[PDB]
Symmetry: D2
Subunit: 474 residues, 4 copies
């Protein structure tokens, strides 16, 4: 109840600075003034390079069907098994102050505090992505963000990049459909997007795809309304998630996976490891795993939502990486991003702490809250008591072939986009076309528009024709 400094000393006057006489100059000995101002000056930290605008909530995951036959992952071992989790939803391009209701993919990050480590499933509200190789991420993101000279958004850059990257057609179609702007985070799906690996106790391998289906149903915002809400309420989605949980209308998602046995995978490498493609659900139907429920709002947004650190590379025994090139790059990127954005010791912050015990030889670093007791910080050592490797946790070995080199991917950039285009109801197709026209129509370089239109035409003649037609009407 008494105001204090950061060292617990009481503050006598929090309204007036120490001054040399009523109208005299302010004194340097007003240490609290200095401290208060200095800490205020250091409140801002760098925002996430992408997915800066987000909302979070605590929850739980409950297994409905054991997956022990496919993975030794502890949190999925028994029916009814509960695991605490934390989720963060977000947009992609917008900065800290941007509006929620913009057209953009939505982040669907999940951190499961399992008994064998924190497992992160860092997905999106889309099963695919715009690119397939991590080396192109900075290029994609740069084209999606601000003009380095004017600081204004550049549709010219957005489309110039996509017109030279046909592999983005599938995701561009999803981005421009109605689902490009969800009604709320509670009304969108979640996907791991990448094909991941599951390994059971016997060492049997399976390639899987995660699908988090919203139990609230898919609902979107028409483009016009979304723009209106972007002005009337830029935190529309954040507020919605918070109010829903405070009103005890806990949103939930049913998680099911597509399971592809190793043997099967050997025939579909070009599809399975290309994140710009989906795996037919007729060939490999969804198998229910459990339910995710968000039931508790953060205590403090900055401490939990802003400081939380997710990484696709945060695996737990039983779940491993696949040769998906985009995923491969992400395995490095996130841990690296965390160290710059939060710090070498970000894992020590409450929201990032593991439920399972952490026993390392890792030491020091900035703001190290806990370095331990031990005099032994190296391994191998002659002290039986200290942490040792667990051979049991080695990843499953797989065969490597050919030469080390720079290989290109498949060129089947049109088939799946066309399939999606054909599945869209007439009313959504008109929106798809108008959304593209409104964006692509802002481009000045006629050569970029033509290249892009030829691309859409290759997906479906009507697709390209309709797009070209909508632009002419402006």
């Amino acid at each position: 109840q008494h105001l204090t400094t950061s060292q617990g000393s009481p503050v006598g006057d929090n309204q007036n600075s120490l001054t040399a006489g009523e109208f005299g100059p302010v004194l340097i000995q007003d240490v609290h003034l200095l401290e208060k101002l200095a800490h205020f000056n250091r409140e801002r930290v760098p925002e996430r390079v992408v997915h800066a605008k987000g909302a979070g909530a605590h929850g739980i995951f409950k297994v409905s069907q054991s997956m022990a036959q496919y993975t030794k992952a502890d949190f999925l071992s028994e029916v009814g098994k509960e695991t605490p989790l934390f989720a963060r939803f977000s947009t992609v391009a917008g900065e800290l102050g941007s509006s929620d209701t913009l057209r953009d993919p939505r982040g669907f990050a999940l951190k499961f505090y399992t008994d064998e480590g924190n497992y992160d499933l860092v997905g999106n509200n889309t099963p695919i992505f715009f690119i397939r190789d991590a080396i192109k991420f900075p290029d994609f993101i740069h084209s999606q963000k601000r003009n380095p000279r004017t600081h204004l958004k550049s549709p010219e850059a957005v489309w110039d990049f996509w017109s030279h990257s046909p592999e983005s057609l599938h995701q561009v179609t999803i981005l421009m459909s109605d689902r490009g702007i969800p009604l709320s985070f509670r009304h969108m799906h979640g996907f791991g997007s990448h094909t991941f690996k599951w390994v059971n106790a016997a060492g049997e391998v399976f390639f899987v795809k995660y699908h988090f289906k919203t139990n609230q149903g898919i609902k979107n915002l028409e483009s016009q309304l979304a723009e209106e809400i972007a002005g009337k309420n830029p935190d529309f989605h954040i507020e919605d998630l918070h109010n829903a949980i405070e009103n005890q209308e806990f949103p939930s998602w049913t998680l099911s996976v597509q399971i592809i046995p190793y043997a099967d995978a050997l025939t579909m490498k070009e599809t399975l490891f290309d994140v710009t493609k989906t795996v037919s659900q007729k060939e490999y139907p969804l198998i229910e795993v459990g339910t995710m429920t968000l039931n508790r709002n953060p205590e403090n947004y900055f401490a939990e939502v802003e400081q939380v650190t997710f990484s696709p590379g945060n695996f737990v025994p039983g779940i491993e990486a696949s040769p998906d090139k985009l995923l491969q790059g992400r395995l490095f990127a996130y841990g690296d991003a965390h160290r710059h954005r939060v710090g070498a010791n970000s894992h020590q912050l409450p929201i990032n702490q593991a439920k399972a015990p952490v026993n390392n030889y890792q030491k020091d670093g900035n703001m190290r809250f806990n370095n331990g007791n031990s005099e032994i910080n190296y391994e191998p050592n002659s002290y039986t008591e200290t942490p040792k490797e667990d051979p049991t946790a080695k990843i499953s070995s797989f065969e490597v072939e050919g030469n080390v080199g720079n290989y290109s991917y498949n060129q089947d950039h049109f088939t799946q986009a066309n399939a999606l285009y054909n599945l869209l109801p007439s009313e959504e197709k008109e929106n798809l076309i108008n959304n593209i026209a409104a964006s692509l129509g802002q481009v000045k370089n006629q050569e970029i528009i033509a290249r892009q239109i030829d691309l859409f035409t290759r997906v479906n003649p009507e697709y390209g024709a309709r797009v070209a037609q909508a632009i002419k009407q402006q």
Copy 2:
């Protein structure tokens, strides 16, 4: 024309990562992939704690009337004297991605590259401020920003704070008037707000107020339209400034000052050093100094607009600080903020470099681009050639009186706000009332609303009555 790494080595493939066989894992030896991703991961820096959303432009200042009789400031010594300058305009509360057209004071920061050092005039588009003591800045800003728990804006906090800080009434009235949302940065005035000190060659002292009057005229956005534009174009003001300069419609401002001699100032301390008050232009009319013109857009936004560092404490001989408590705190705050946000050596970045020679004993620090030749980094020393103090630049001494202590200011919070309220034309008064009602009306704590309404009533009975009525009608 050849893509290279940061060390100038050519890049062979910028589309595909090095992989162990066509469908094999990505290799750690792809150093460029690592570098490209790692540098991308470090692109974000902390945004300014306040005034994060801004736009900048290069320009010049030209003296129309020498001020040598009042100040020995070199850049104001001769008629026609030109000085290069850089300006940054901004809002206050919004983060990097926020919209331009929001109700908020606007920053009017100017950096003059004079022959005797970089002189910064860090003003606002208002002659006054909400508080008078720097110790309250973090409190004011916290109330103006996001709820620490929900991350949503809180009118409850905004008004709770103002209802307990009657000294804010004057500026709140300005904030809520039409000028609260300018049509563009080119259509608002600029002010130093604080009373500053001018000293001539003879050592004569004058207290002054800076007034930058827009030569394009004052123009504002009605609240409704502003909200609409906030959605349709969040970078409306940034784009406007850039287009105007690219179209050669160089915006300009006429600078004039109010000059109060030492002898006069002796009787007006309570008004002169209170930033919530203005000085009558009838008693002390504006005296023209020169013209500021913005005629060149930035080469790169991040390098120039984001990294530029301004400080009210960046004085040049002839211009000094006054005992204004708010100003006094700012003398510390900015340099401190720069060191955290940009770095100890931010002055070495092109946009922050002084035109005038920099000769110090300051050394090292992170990313030190230039440490010099000298073996002598201490003073006093026996080397005549090294930089020495210039007694000529000592500030003018002034008398100090009474006891060191925590003094409060005057309680005259209503008179000037009432004067302003009485000068507003009927149509703007209606807007003033509706703007307040829309905001204060969102508060839940009836005790806060009542306290605030009693405050407005004390400014003018009609003022408070109209506000109360407006709220009741919702």
Copy 3:
């Protein structure tokens, strides 16, 4: 007992990196390799700008005589009152890897975890200092450290600076005496050096000087042996402190103060506020306060000794600052240094946490371990429950006189140094002279040596004569 990653996931192989085939390239998907290497890469933090090489220990302070008649400081209110504390001893110029047994003042930093906040007494093993104005600290330290060009120590710089700063004579004499190199941290005294202020419950003011006298007695190392030990064992003092405590030979110090009533200061401002001078002990004898005992070694050196943050400005009710210009500058310097070296939230690290409750409106910042529950982060506010100022803690007001300006101190640089020179026994005087000769004798600029010798001659004719002669014999 199982080795894990920072997220608690088990490590399968801590001896071999993931590789594409026995002799194939290392894979980027070995996330643990990446993490382990990356955290290792961030273990180093910037060392303290001064006093980088140190040792620490936990202990207690026990009051033997209540000081309630002179100060309302809670930790000194009752006889027998115990207060937990942490101490850090160090040299001044040496970097992290430098040897302990070098000639240099020794730091004597103490952090008392009192019930009204952490009180820091940041003193040295000397009652005085080399300079009297904080504006000269960077200059003094630069001259004391490495040549910016060669990175070698420079006696030319050391003496050039002292030869132009006669106020350093007193401390130079102490530095060059036998006490310039203590046998161990347990065999040196501690002093607050500066005159501080004590205020009792009635508001009565007293100026005080802190004296921590070693209960183990003063013992020093002859110059030759110290140099030998600097090679044979660079951590001689650190090891000594640790072994002594592990062997239960707890070192202790008896703290007593010199108490000067406010009114008495009227004739001593020139002495009392000039840190290059001491106050006569005959006029103002030592008054015992209590005993400090170090009885527990750190759990981890980096976490406690390296990360601890001390500040002379960390006062508690009853103890305040004096107008000593050097002290005044330190009031700013330390908190500022902490924010750069450790971080904005360094107060949250265990070693820096207050025992007394910390209730602020300060929020966020890098690595914020605790932001709290409250939605209210601004004051004044309408929530009675939130932290409020305690008028009772306001500092005692004192009168200010004259003009704001740049004033110079006293010119009596010789009297006290001469008194000390006359008190030294013949054998220590020979050492004093030889120590100076060995150092000053390395200077090349004959003008610097002459200026310095004239200075010593002014302290005492014999002093200067002996120094000049000792140098001649080289």
Copy 4:
């Protein structure tokens, strides 16, 4: 000649702080005091995690024999071709203030500013290393540095680690020989240690080993003298290099390589890619390449020596990495270390700038000195003028075999160490034994000593016997 602030404004008084009256408190408006102190507070940056204590110098490399037949490396294309370079020599374990003359490997880092990028050869004064897998580096270094609890060096940890890592025997033997402490940096050799790859214009591949032989000859310090010098002059090696260059006694090294054709290498993978082993000089004799000469001291130590960034991964066309596991980890480690220690934009500091043009899409980041002109920061793009990949620079592809997994290396840890032991003259062998005895003899755990002695015995019965015998005599 006039002292100024960082913004070029003149300083009036650099000896006295602004004060409210002669004996009044210091004023916060003394912005220069604040700035001077604040910048001084930020002078320290984190030291290198290893090799913190070093010295540097500028020089040149002149080709004596063209290597065009083996590598297309531009700087080695013609006889007489000169390339500017910068070198940094250092120890390994010691911190910034440690002494030069300690037993430890010496760093031999070289940065060649070639016309096709900065090529870094980051070697040591030994052809081998203690470990063969990067995953063990943090463990090795931790054992070599300070006890986490006491902060004292721990021979118990040093030997515990080596006793469990027999692959270190070869390098330990070199470390303990006379060459463990060079007389000066000018009297030691330099090696790349790892086997690197050379590829010529026709695409032919060769595996190479770099050997920089000192033209001043090998000279060492006996252990006793080294310890003496460690106390008398901790910067003995730094001073030596500087004086030599200032006296125009430019030290030089003759570089020659061992060249192993791809076909030959196919049979020696276990030796070639194991850094604890050397390639026979009879089978593959040294082939002279050119001469390295150091002829210019740094302008400023901090700016050049402290801030320079080297990386084994900084290759230039014609030189590539080999599957050496230790090297592989280093390819990641250095760039990562630079980003933490110096910053994302360290490549922009003068000492790190490339001579060859740098054309990227990399942008922003902290302290970005140059972001350029371009509006185009993404690739692919439709602007012919912007930087594009150079397929010509792709690395040579090589075959990968088997399974992805955690493979262990060769177990031949004794043969080469024995060969070296047999080549040492009697007098050096006695030193080798005594050096080991003095160190290993300090270990308490008899089980560690026994394990280690059995290891030496396995190298050579006499080796182990002599070591065991030397210890017994203590």
